[PDB]
Amino acid sequence: MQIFVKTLTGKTITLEVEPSDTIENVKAKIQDKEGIPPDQQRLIFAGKQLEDGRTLSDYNIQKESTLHLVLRLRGX
Amino acid sequence: MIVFVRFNSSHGFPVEVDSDTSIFQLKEVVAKRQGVPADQLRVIFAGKELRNDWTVQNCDLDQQSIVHIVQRPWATNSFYVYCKGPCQRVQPGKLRVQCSTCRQATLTLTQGPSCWDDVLIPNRMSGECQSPHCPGTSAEFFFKCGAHPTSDKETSVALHLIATNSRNITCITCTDVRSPVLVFQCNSRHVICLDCFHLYCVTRLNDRQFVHDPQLGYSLPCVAGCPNSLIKELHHFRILGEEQYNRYQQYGAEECVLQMGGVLCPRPGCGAGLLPEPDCRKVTCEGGNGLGCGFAFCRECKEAYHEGECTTQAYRVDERAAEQARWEAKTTKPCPRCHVPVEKNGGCMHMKCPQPQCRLEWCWNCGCEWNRVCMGDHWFDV
Ligand SMILES: [Cl-]
Ligand SMILES: [Zn+2]
Ligand SMILES: [Zn+2]
Ligand SMILES: [Zn+2]
Ligand SMILES: [Zn+2]
Ligand SMILES: [Zn+2]
Ligand SMILES: [Zn+2]
Ligand SMILES: [Zn+2]
Ligand SMILES: [Zn+2]
Known part of the structure; x- marks a missing residue:
C-alpha cells in the first residue's frame, strides 16, 4: 500500500509499505528516498509521536494516509 | 466597527461592520471578501449559531472577539466505518472475523463478541481454527464498508463512537433528532x-x-x-x-512539536518542525531537499541568530439540552420457536434457547435463526 510522509514545509514523500511494517522500517524507507538518518527522523500521526517498535497496523494508518516528518537536529 | 473573523484557519482577519449590521449582512461582507456563496456560510459566536435577523450589537460582539465562519453545502447496524473510496463518507459497516495466524475465515469462536473491546483489542477473543494445518487460538476482527461489493483487502476503519439513533435522542447543540x-x-x-x-x-x-x-x-x-x-x-x-x-x-x-519541547521555523512559508537539544539557542532549519530553508535563528526571539540578548473561546451548551442528549438516560424475550422466555446476558445478539426440546439459535434483534448477515450487521448491541 502507498502512504505519504509530509514535512511541515509541505515536502511529500510517497512510500510503498505494508500494515505490518514497523516505524523503524518506515524511517529506513525514508532514508533510502531522502538520505535522512533515522535517528534524526520523528514521525507523527494525528499529533501522536510514533514509536519505532510499533507497526502501522497498531496506529490504524490506512491506504494513502499521511505521516508527519519532524527533525531532531544535531550541530543545537 | 471591527470584528475578527476565523474561516478555515487560525489566522483571523478583521472585517468592517456597524452595530446595526445584521448577521445576514456580515455573511455578505465575508462572501464578497472570500468569493464564496453566502447561503453556505454558518456564523458561530461562542459555540452558538447566530440568527441572521439579529444585529452585530445584539450578538454581544464587543471588540475584536472571534466570529467563526463555517462553509456547509446542502436493516439494523451496530457498526459504522469511514469509507475512503468510493463513498468518501461514514457508512454502516460489516464486521468480519478471521484466524490471526493463517488470516483465513476458518476461526470458530468460543462465544461471540459482546462489545467494542472484543472486536477492537488484538487477541482479546479466543477460538479454534478449522483449516487443514493451523494451530491458531486467537481471533482477528476487521470491518468493511457495507454500502457496496467488497475486496478481501479493502478494509475500513471502524468509527465506534457512530450509532443509528434508534433511541430518538436529541442532539446536545441543536436539539434535533438526527441519525447517525x-x-x-x-x-x-x-x-x-x-x-x-x-x-x-x-x-x-x-x-x-x-x-x-x-x-x-x-x-x-x-x-x-x-x-x-x-x-x-x-x-x-x-x-x-x-x-x-x-x-x-x-x-x-x-x-506535537511544540509539546515535544521543538519550535517551528519562523521563516515565511517554512514552519518546519525542528527539535533542538535542551541547551541550544542557535537553531538551524536542517534538512536538505526539505525541511530545507535552511535559516539559522534564535530559539527565543525567533530573529536571525545573534550573539547578545533579545482569547480562549467558550463553546456554550444548554444544561437542559445536555440532560436530554444522553444515550442511556427489555430484559427477557420469548424464544421465536417455542415461546419459552430467554434472558439476555451482555451485548452479544447471538441467543441460544435453553429449552432442551428446542435449543434454537436466534438473533435477539430480529427474532430469526442465527445467520452470517446478523453477525456482520449487529453481532452485538450498542
Ligand atoms: Cl438535547
Ligand atoms: Zn463505501
Ligand atoms: Zn488459522
Ligand atoms: Zn445537532
Ligand atoms: Zn526553515
Ligand atoms: Zn534572540
Ligand atoms: Zn459529555
Ligand atoms: Zn426455544
Ligand atoms: Zn439480526
Missing part, C-alpha cells in the same frame, strides 16, 4: 449529530483549542466539556472531510 449520531465516552454519554460535530471540530480547530495528550495525540472531549471524554479513535475526524481532516493533521503535528 456521535456518542461521546463521557459518563453522561452525550450525543451530537454529525452537522453539529462538524461545527464543533472546525471552530475548535480554528481556535487551536483541540487537546494534546502525549499517548493519544490531538483530539477533543465532549462539547459539554465532560472530563475523561477525549475521542480515542482519531479517524473520527475523517467525518470532517479530507481538507478539514488534513488541516487537523497539520495543526496536530505543529502542537
